[PDB]
Amino acid sequence: QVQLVQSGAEVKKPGSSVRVSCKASGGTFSTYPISWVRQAPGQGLEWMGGIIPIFGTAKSAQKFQGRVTITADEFTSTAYMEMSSLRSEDTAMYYCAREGRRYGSGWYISTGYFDYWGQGTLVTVSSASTKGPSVFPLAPSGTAALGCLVKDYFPEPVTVSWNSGALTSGVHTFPAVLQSSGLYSLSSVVTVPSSSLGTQTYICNVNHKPSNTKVDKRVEPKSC
Amino acid sequence: NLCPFGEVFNATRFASVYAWNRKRISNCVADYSVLYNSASFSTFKCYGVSPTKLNDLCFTNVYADSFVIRGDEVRQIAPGQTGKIADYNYKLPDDFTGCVIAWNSNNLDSKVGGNYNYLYRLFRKSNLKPFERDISTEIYQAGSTPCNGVEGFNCYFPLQSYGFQPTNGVGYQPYRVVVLSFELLHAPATVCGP
Amino acid sequence: LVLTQPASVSGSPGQSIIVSCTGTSSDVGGYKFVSWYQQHPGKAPRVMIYDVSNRPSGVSNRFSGSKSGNTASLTISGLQADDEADYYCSSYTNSSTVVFGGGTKVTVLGQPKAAPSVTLFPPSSEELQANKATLVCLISDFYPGAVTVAWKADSSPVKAGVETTTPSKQSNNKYAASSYLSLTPEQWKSHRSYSCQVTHEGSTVEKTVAPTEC
Ligand SMILES: *[C@@H]1O[C@H](CO[C@@H]2O[C@@H](C)[C@@H](O)[C@@H](O)[C@@H]2O)[C@@H](O[C@@H]2O[C@H](CO)[C@@H](O)[C@H](O)[C@H]2NC(C)=O)[C@H](O)[C@H]1NC(C)=O
Ligand SMILES: *[C@@H]1O[C@H](CO)[C@@H](O)[C@H](O)[C@H]1NC(C)=O
């Protein structure tokens, strides 16, 4: 029942610094190695470093030395990654990853065996400012498709649920597009019975954490 | 110049039993019956003496060893006991001259979802000698295959965490323990009663 | 340092495939500390193999690992559509670091072909009242995952203001794609009709919407 829960996505200006947190629950924290692994959008995994809290020992890849600090708070069961002088190439999903085993003192920090992962934290390095999304309904008229269009937001990510999580079957939330305006837009669709169009409620719940915004949009059938 | 027993008993954090803390107490006055005249202590058992006599006795030193264990292991903090704690974590001598004091710390050392920060040694090649402290962290080789510092089959990490949740049975709830040992050297005695 | 993996490996259902991962004697060829991770879209990686060939509990025995010289290999047997994912090798190094391979996308070929269902959404009244217009062409339940999208105003081709997503895997192992045609309200009012044309495996489907549809 070990769980790694990471802090929320954010945007940071170039040259500033970021702190990502990962709280570990449901098991021993101090004796297990913890690593940080980042993934640029559409790119591969890259190991940043790791720490064994009880030993006070740490190790980072050389490209991250002097710029990345990995720490641990044993009393709150929380690992931390801190990155200074942020560049746009630091835009990535940052993952907390616990080692699948422990090592004796004087041995390895991590050998690359990771059992539990955090959910990931999207850090976007940009000088553009956040802006909340604009949610519009895609109304329906067998089965019928409906959805909502989440328009003109920055940065990524946006999460979409339906009926507060009670509607997941038949749901597809598309990848966002980068419009020429520099803002993001996506759609989320669901196919539903047409007999249910007059009675069942369909509400799309959009969360944009970088703007701390939540938008509920009711999607009603068009009767014109 | 009262002995700083409040530093030990009223400490915010306690040590894990495998790395039990030892504080020396010297050149002070020790009014012992502030304690024992306290119903807060669920265990207060002295072996070399009885504590109402201790306000009338003098010692060269007094060592206060503090740590946290679980309820059903309190019995192990006594001379001539066996078990995981007595064998691998904290051992009292048979000729023990001192007191063992302990109280339930469920409201401090337990947490919703479980406090896993307190550890104990679960595996060791041999039993501890009296007052021996082992803070090593070598992978325990249970079988014939060397471990090379990597936990796995027949190769166990030596320390385990207690699982302290507020709803644990009393035998599994945390208990804070202070062991006072009374050291009498052939030097001037430095701690006394009033 | 990036361990060398093939960019792409494909197989048919029930087939056995192999993902290779080549390093040097200072990493892959120097230690038994090679692991293999599976990553589906939008999810964290999941360890499939560790220490060359050890399989964690909960991982199907269809996955196995081996290593010789500087090259480790993940063999996936009885290929299934849900095995479609990115697979990364990881290795310990003589600098005491962990390095990953570049990743291999595993795709299952030869599943039953599916024609794309297409729904074309006209601009919502709320967006028009916000002084914008977006036509949304949504494409669902097709396989293989490759389509072409064309937009027509009346019968004239359009490219200005069109953005199309790369097909994404649904939950039923089919594919879906999205295409957007951005118009001002005036352009939307100004035409008789608008059409989205989706071509897939020689088939072409067309959907049309009109501002006067009410
Ligand atoms: C870690 O390994 C590198 C690389 O080792 C070399 O390449 C291997 C594939 C294998 O052929 C080894 O025998 C090689 O030595 C070490 O870097 C080398 O260091 C030596 C000694 O200074 C030098 O002559 C080589 O040119 C270096 N090669 C490269 C590619 O840099 C490195 O020293 C090792 N580090 C540790 C801490 O052991
Ligand atoms: C701990 O605190 C209580 C309350 O202040 C006090 O009565 C007690 O004497 C203290 N313990 C010691 C050993 O001084």
Residue numbers in the entry:
A (entry chain H): 1 to 52, 52A, 53 to 82, 82A, 82B, 82C, 83 to 100, 100A, ...
B (entry chain A): 334 to 527
C (entry chain L): 2 to 9, 11 to 27, 27A, 27B, 27C, 28 to 95, 95A, 96 to 106, ...
What text comes from the article?
SARS-CoV-2 and SARS-CoV-1 belong to the same viral subgenus of SARS-related CoV (SARSr-CoV), and share 79.6% nucleotide sequence identity (Zhou et al., 2020). Their entry into human cells is initiated by interaction between the receptor binding domain (RBD) of the virus spike protein (S protein) and the cell surface receptor angiotensin-converting enzyme 2 (ACE2) (Shang et al., 2020; Tai et al., 2020; Walls et al., 2020; Zhou et al., 2020). While most of these antibodies directly block interaction between ACE2 and RBD of the SARS-CoV-2 S protein, 47D1 binds only to one side of the receptor binding surface on the RBD and exhibits highly potent neutralizing activity. Taken together, our results demonstrated that 47D1 neutralizes SARS-CoV-2 by suppressing spike-mediated membrane fusion, rather than blocking virus binding to ACE2-expressing cells.
Binding of 47D1 to the RBD is dominated by its heavy chain, with the heavy and light chains conferring buried surface areas (BSAs) of 716 and 34 Å2 on the RBD, respectively. 47D1 uses CDRs H1, H2, framework region 3 (HFR3), and H3, with minimal contributions from L1 and L2 for RBD interaction. The planar backbone conformation of VH G26 and VH G27 of CDR H1 stacks with RBD Y449, while the side chain of VH T28 hydrogen bonds with RBD S494. The conserved “IF” motif in certain alleles of VH1-69 antibodies, consisting of VH I53 and VH F54 at the tip of CDR H2, is involved in a hydrophobic aromatic and aliphatic patch with RBD Y351, L452, I468, and F490. The CDR H3 side chains and backbone make a set of hydrogen bonds and salt bridges with RBD E484, Q493, and T470. Together with VL F32 and VH Y99, W100c and Y100d of the CDR H3 also form a hydrophobic pocket with the side chain of RBD V483. V483A is a natural mutation of SARS-CoV-2 (Li et al., 2020). This mutation reduces 47D1 binding and neutralization, as mutation to alanine likely weakens the hydrophobic interaction. Germline VL Y32 is mutated to F32 to avoid clash with RBD V483, so that it can form a hydrophobic pocket together with CDR H3 to interact with V483.
